[PDB]
Amino acid sequence: MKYLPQQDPQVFAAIEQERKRQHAKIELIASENFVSRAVMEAQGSVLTNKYAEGYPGRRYYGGCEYVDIVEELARERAKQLFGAEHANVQPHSGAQANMAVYFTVLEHGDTVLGMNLSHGGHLTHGSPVNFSGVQYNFVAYGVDPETHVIDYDDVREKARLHRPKLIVAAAAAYPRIIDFAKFREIADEVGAYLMVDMAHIAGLVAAGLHPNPVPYAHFVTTTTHKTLRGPRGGMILCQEQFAKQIDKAIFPGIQGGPLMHVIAAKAVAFGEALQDDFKAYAKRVVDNAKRLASALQNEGFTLVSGGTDNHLLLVDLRPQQLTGKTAEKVLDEVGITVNKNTIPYDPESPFVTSGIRIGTAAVTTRGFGLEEMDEIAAIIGLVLKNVGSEQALEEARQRVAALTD
Amino acid sequence: MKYLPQQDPQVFAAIEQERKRQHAKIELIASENFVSRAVMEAQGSVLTNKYAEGYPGRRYYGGCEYVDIVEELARERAKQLFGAEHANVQPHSGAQANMAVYFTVLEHGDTVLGMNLSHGGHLTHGSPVNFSGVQYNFVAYGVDPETHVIDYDDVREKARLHRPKLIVAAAAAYPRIIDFAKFREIADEVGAYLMVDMAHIAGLVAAGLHPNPVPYAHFVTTTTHKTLRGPRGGMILCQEQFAKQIDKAIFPGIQGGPLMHVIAAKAVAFGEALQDDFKAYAKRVVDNAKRLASALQNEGFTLVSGGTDNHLLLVDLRPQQLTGKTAEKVLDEVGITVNKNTIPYDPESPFVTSGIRIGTAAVTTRGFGLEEMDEIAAIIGLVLKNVGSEQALEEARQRVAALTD
């Protein structure tokens, strides 16, 4: 940076602290990643200055010729990545992407069926403190109490009982592959639309490591900033028949001016995802997660579902008689960032929990491999088995530092 | 830029086109401005990598120590700028800032009273194709057919007849000072909340050149990117009694993870606005708008309301027998960017219009003064009085180029 250090010492100091923090810590927050310098440069561009309400070639402001090229690059690259008939790259966030799909097909009070929030569903899939649960009547399907795999018979029964207008599939904390063919079969049986929220697994889908929801879903929503390793924002994919309706839901429906600079950054991130080396990266993410899961089990930890098919894992801490809150706190003390997370059928409140959620996307981006996974697992074991030992926590601290260099 | 040119030639070429376009054209879009290099650097920072749901010191992810400092800097500087008891700097946009206030105080189908959209009101103030008009029952107050000034007796009558739960004041295209004391008096009479959407005039308010709505409104919403000359985003100000409710409306209510990098950029923009030279800038904006208005009248143009108290003006093109659409198009041909805009009691549809909206914020930022205002007015006269003369349009083109250098 050149101008910010001089203009704003206070903001620059805090950014520099954050930059240094990102390098020093082992970031295992499953939803986080590190973007390229190219992506950041696009976000730091003059495109923030441009009002561009509407769509490429159909804007409500003149002078959009070049931002149109940028948005089109984003849409076309997204269609190339996922094989969607239509893309909308304007959603400000995952929240707004979901909001727009709901706005498109639902009326106030319509019934929607989504994944139980305590079994892995997201806030925007019907939380009573979120617009989703306040605006719509959300019902929930669960995972099996033993396998922690989605119970597709429960999905079906809930659908047939409650007759939802929309079924939502996908998750903030589900470690196994989701069967989209089965969701669509159930949706078809009850005459419901199917929406897949692939936010967490979007990079894995793009690399062919998770089945693609696009052929099965009427609508696919996602963030651009998790496994897809892009800037912070949302996106909607859908078939051509819903294109006009989806576009109008985003604008003039729920948003105003799009963030053209962030859309530029989306295009950059999509360009990166189309490359062979992104495919290799995504495989290392999944491989690392498998290795980490196995290594944690070797340390004596129980994992929700017994492992992982994707980038993320959930530790069930009940055998160690720890809450997720306690584990989160102590790991924070040694420089490992995780989040507490409810496990299926958790006896604890969502503010306490019996679990921690862990993901490998971020550490893989910084070049960690299988050996580092073993060591991260060894450090977690050392810490969680010795929460009362300051000497153990200091050893952990030193081993964490050895990893981040 | 260093990395984007190499990583993504296509995106870089289009950004560079846009950068060059921004310098070559005379940008008179009333909602646009040019941000500082410091603001852009903050948006281009690693802060995009951080999930930070919740609020400073009350986050739902660890590792937020430094992003907390950034968000707090933004909130405290905003409170310093506007004298608000509480600030929420997380809204992704003006749309979402409004959305959150509505979510806070209204139930589905509640009556809201806002400014007539064809008289200057915004899309988010009750358009039947926007969430506002679909979710809530919007009624409208108008401006006087002669003066084009808000008819406060009409505001009062509509309020007493329709009994709104919420009254919205402020505009996307209103060239005169708004009387917030009168809005609050009416709100008090009918027992309605008062929301002021100061998006357009926020920089003018901060510089003391427009009366401050904060003392009179229960809620004040704004964008950060118009006269405030910040990054693209939204903000809510409110009294302490609504702080907890407003924060919860933004999250977990209508958004997810905030854009911490954009919030950093907000803090930077607020720091800039607190400086004396911003005050001088904002006065030049208003002075330039007055000068431009006077100069256009000298050219024979009729202005909605007979002039301006702020950054923006509306030309009523009916005396020249032109539509706003025609004027917009021909001005685009010579390198002047305006937008068509409905005038009060416009006989034309909003897709055609009888007016053009013009603002001075952007040209003032690039250092245009009174002499440049005279010349811009002279060029507009030359073009609009000679729409069929390619020689006149070429002279205009050359004079536009002379201004942007």
Contact list, B27 vs chain A (CB under 8 Å): 63
A116 and A198: one domain? yes
Q: Do B130 and A231 touch (CB under 8 A)?
A: no
State the amino acid at position A267 in one-letter form.
Answer: A
Report the alpha-carbon angle B164-B170-B175, nearest 5.
140
The pair of three-digit structure tokens given for residue B295, joined into one six-digit string: 């100069």
Give SS3 for B189.
Answer: helix
- Give the dihedral sign, CA B169/B174/B178/B183: negative
Domain identity same for B59 and B144: yes
Given the structure tokens 């405290």, which residue do they identify?
A: B76
Q: Among B245, B257, B111, which residue's Cα sits nearest to residue B190? A: B111
Question: Do A119 and A159 fall within a single domain?
Answer: yes
Final residue before a domain boundary, out of A262, A283, A304: A283
- The CATH number of whichever domain residue A119 belongs to comes to 3.40.640.10
Q: What is the C-alpha separation between B225 and B200, in angstroms, rounded?
A: 9
- Give the minimum alpha-carbon distance from B36 to chain A in angstroms, rounded to a whole number: 9
Please tell me the distance in Å from A370's CA to the nearest CA on chain B. Answer: 24
User: What single-letter amino acid sits at B232?
Assistant: R
| Residue B183 near residue B171, CB atoms below 8 Å | no
Angle between helices A370-384 and A276-298 (to 10 degrees): 30
Q: How many domains does chain A have?
A: 2
Looking from the CA of B58 toward its CB, the CA atoms found within 13 Å total 8
d(CA A249, CA B129): 9
Contact between residue A355 and residue A364 where contact means Cβ atoms under 8 Å apart: no
Facing residue for B232 by CB, picked from A257, A267, A338: A257
φ/ψ of B62, rounded to 5, equals -70, 170
Preferred mutation among B41, B96, B268 to probe A, highest tally of A CBs within 10 A: B41
Question: How far is B128 from chain A, CA to nearest CA, in Å?
Answer: 9
Same domain, B229 and B127: yes
Euclidean distance between CA atoms B42 and B202, whole angstroms: 21
The answer to whether residues B9 and B59 belong to one domain is no
Chain centroid to Cα A328, Å, comes to: 19
Residue of A32, A53, A72, A185 marked catalytic: A53
Of A6, A14, A73, the CB nearest to B69: A14
User: Helices A324-334 and A390-404: crossing angle, nearest 10°?
Assistant: 60
Residue B112 φ/ψ, nearest 5 degrees? -130, 140
Assigned token pair, B19:
């950068």
> Cα–Cα distance between A77 and B316 in angstroms, integer?
43
CB contact (8 A) between residue A4 and residue B73: no
Tokens of B179: 């009387």
Q: Is A307 left (phi over 0), alpha (psi -120 to 50) or beta?
A: left
Residue B352 is inside which H or E element, if any? none
Give me the residue label for tokens 């602290």. A17
How many Å apart are CA A356 and CA A315, to the nearest integer?
A: 5
Contact at CB, A15 and B45, closer than 8 angstroms: yes
Containing B15, the helix (H) or strand (E) segment is helix B9-24
Label residues B346-359 b or e (16+ Cβ within 10 Å = b).
Answer: bebeeeebbbbbbb
Structure tokens given for B12? 């870089």
Rounded CA gap, A353 and A351, in Å? 6
* Residue B255 to residue A93, Cβ atoms within 8 A: yes
Cβ atoms A200, A226 nearer than 8 A: yes
**CB-nearest partner of B15 from A135, A255, A264:** A264
Instruction: Please choose, from the candidates B47, B7, B259, the residue with its C-alpha nearest in 3D space to the C-alpha of residue A269.
Output: B7
Kindly state the tokens that stand for B291: 């000068």
Q: Which residues in chain B have their CB less than 8 angstroms from residue A127's CB?
A: 252
Residues of B marked as catalytic: 51, 53, 197, 223, 226, 232
The residue count for chain A: 405
A267: chain B residues, CB-CB within 8 Å = 8, 10-11
Nearest CB neighbour to B96, from listed A47, A92, A127: A92
Spatial CA neighbour of A310 closest among A184, A401, A174, A137: A174
Question: How far apart are the CA of B39 and the nearest CA of chain A, in angstroms?
Answer: 7
CA dihedral B307, B311, B317, B320 (to 10 degrees): 70
Q: What is the rounded distance in angstroms from the CA atom of residue A402 to the CA atom of residue A86?
A: 46
Instruction: Single out the residue in B233, B261, B283 at which a domain terminates.
Output: B283
- Tokens 């009333």 correspond to B30
Q: Enumerate the residues of chain A whose CB falls inside 8 A of the CB of residue B8.
A: 38, 42, 267-268, 271
Output phi, psi for B303, to 5 deg.
-110, 135
- Look at the alpha carbons of B291, B292, B293, B299 in this order and tell me if their dihedral is positive or negative: positive
Among residues A50, A158, A226, A340, which one is catalytic?
A: A226
> Which chain A positions have a beta carbon within 8 Å of B128's beta carbon?
none
* B248: chain A residues, CB-CB within 8 Å: 129
Contact A49 B34 (CB under 8 A): yes
Task: State the maximum Cα–Cα separation within chain B, in Å, rounded to a whole number.
Answer: 65
Residues A297 and A211 in one domain: no
Shortest Cα distance from A153 to chain B (angstroms)?
31
Angle, helices B370-384/B390-404, rounded to nearest 10 degrees: 160
φ, ψ for residue B352, nearest 5 deg: -115, -60
**Three-class DSSP category at B148:** coil
CA–CA separation, B396 vs B404, rounded Å? 13
State the catalytic residue, choosing from A27, A68, A71, A197. Answer: A197
**Domain that residue B294 falls in:** 1-32+284-405
**Helices and strands (H, E) in chain B, number of each type:** 16, 15
Which residues does chain A have within 8 Å of residue B41's beta carbon, measured at their own beta carbons?
1-4, 44
Active-site annotation holds for A353: no
Q: What three-state secondary structure class fits B188?
A: helix
Catalytic annotation, pick one of A51, A156, A318, A375: A51
A337/B62 Cβ within 8 A: yes
Same-domain pairing of A50 and A28: no
Do residues A265 and A327 share a domain? no
What is the rounded distance in angstroms from the CA atom of residue A389 to the CA atom of residue A387? Answer: 6
Q: Flag if A15 and B264 touch (Cβ within 8 Å).
A: yes
**Chain B environment of A17 (Cβ under 8 Å):** 65-66, 69
DSSP letters for B42-111: HHTSGGGG----EETTEESSS--HHHHHHHHHHHHHHHHHH--SEEE---SSHHHHHHHHHHHH--TT-E
Cα Rg for chain A, rounded, in angstroms?
21
Structure tokens at B135: 């979710």
Q: Find the CB nearest A256 among B124, B272, B328.
A: B124
> Is B45 close to A7, i.e. CB distance below 8 A?
no
Nearest to B4 among A2, A38, A46 (CB): A38
Q: How far is A19 from chain B (nearest CA, A)?
A: 6
* Residue among A1, A18, A264 minimizing CB distance to B47: A18
DSSP per-residue letters across B233-292: -EEEEE-HHHHHHHHHIIIIII--S--HHHHHHHHHHHHHHTSHHHHHHHHHHHHHHHHH
CA dist B313 and B27 (Å) reads: 14
d(CA B223, CA B185): 25
Residues of chain B found within 8 Å of residue A10, distances taken between Cβ atoms? 73, 267, 271
Q: Do B129 and A248 touch (CB under 8 A)?
A: yes
Contact yes or no for A198/A227 (Cβ under 8 A): no
Check if the beta carbon of residue B126 is closer than 8 Å to that of residue B117.
yes
**C-alpha span between A288 and A365 (Å, rounded):** 11
The verdict on a CB contact (< 8 Å) between A96 and B99 is no
Burial class of residue A344 in the structure, from the number of CB atoms within 10 Å of its CB (0-12 exposed, 13-18 middle, 19+ buried):
buried
What is the spatial distance between Cα A166 and Cα A110, in angstroms, rounded to a whole number? 9
Among A235, A250, A283, residue at a domain's last position? A283
Nearest to B51 by CA among B280, B316, B364, B260: B260
Asked if A304 and A175 touch (Cβ cutoff 8 Å), the reply is yes
Q: Which two tokens stand for residue A5?
A: 């250090």
Whether residue A14 is found in the same domain as residue A51:
no
State the Cα–Cα distance between residues A86 and A84, nearest whole angstrom: 5
Decide if A50 and B32 are in contact by the 8 Å CB cutoff. Answer: yes
* B6 and B50 in a common domain: no
Q: Given the structure tokens 């490429």, which residue do they identify? A: A56
Nearest Cβ partner of A255 from B7, B95, B259?
A: B95
Q: Are residues B170 and B222 in the same domain?
A: yes
Domain of residue A323, CATH code: 3.90.1150.10
SS3 per residue for chain A:
CCCHHHHCHHHHHHHHHHHHHHHHCEECCCCCCCCCHHHHHHHCCHHHHCCCCEECCEECCCCCHHHHHHHHHHHHHHHHHHCCCEEECCCCCHHHHHHHHHHHHCCCCCEEEEECHHHCCCCCCCCCCCHHHHHCEEEEECECCCCCCECHHHHHHHHHHHCCCEEEECCCCCCCCCCHHHHHHHHHHHCCEEEEECCCCHHHHHCCCCCCCCCCCCEEEEECCCCCCCCCCEEEEECHHHHHHHHHHHHHHHCCCCCHHHHHHHHHHHHHHCCHHHHHHHHHHHHHHHHHHHHHHHCCCEEHHHCCCCCEEEEECHHHCCCHHHHHHHHHHHCEECEECCCCCCCCCCCCCCEEEEECHHHHHCCCCHHHHHHHHHHHHHHHCCCCCHHHHHHHHHHHHHHHC
Q: How far apart are CA B88 and CA B72, in angstroms?
A: 10
Task: Tell me which amino acid residue A284 is.
Answer: R
Local structure of B340: helix, strand or coil: strand
Q: Does B67 share its domain with B22?
A: no
Question: CA of A273, closest CA in chain B: separation in Å?
Answer: 12
B140: Cβ–Cβ under 8 A, 6 or more apart, which residues?
A: B113, B114, B115, B116, B117, B119, B121, B126, B158
